[PDB]
């Protein structure tokens, strides 16, 4: 994966940063941290060979419940260039004003 490692490192670093500034973090949030690094350990070891694609789907959809749950776990950002409404850069090049039998015609 190489990204669960980054997310977990960021999460525990933020956890201990809060324990440095403050002396308290919600244990309801420490539970999410615990789930996160347990999954990170399990997927990056000898236990990943039991993972199917359905298992991967379920694991990802369960992990995304942790995404914006706390300040420590944050929504990951991936490299994407898409959107729900894509652009139309096609160009119109008519040929000799030629209509076809029914439709118009281009190059």
């Amino acid at each position: 994966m190489d990204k669960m490692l980054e997310i977990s490192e960021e999460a525990i670093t933020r956890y201990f940063t809060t324990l440095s500034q403050f002396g308290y973090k919600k244990y309801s949030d420490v539970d999410k941290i615990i789930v996160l690094f347990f999954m990170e350990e399990m997927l990056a070891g000898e236990m990943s060979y039991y993972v199917t694609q359905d298992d991967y789907r379920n694991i990802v959809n369960a992990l995304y419940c942790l995404a914006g749950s706390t300040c420590m776990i944050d929504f990951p950002m991936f490299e994407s260039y898409d959107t729900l409404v894509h652009s139309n850069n096609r160009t119109f090049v008519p040929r000799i004003t030629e209509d076809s039998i029914l439709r118009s015609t281009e190059d």
Partner: peptide, 21 residues
């Protein structure tokens, strides 16, 4: 809540993750 156990585990894993990254 086993708070001491959790604290020790997180203390170790902080070093572990910071090393692996």
């Amino acid at each position: 809540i086993p708070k001491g156990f959790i604290d020790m585990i997180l203390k170790l894993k902080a070093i572990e993750l910071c090393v692996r990254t």
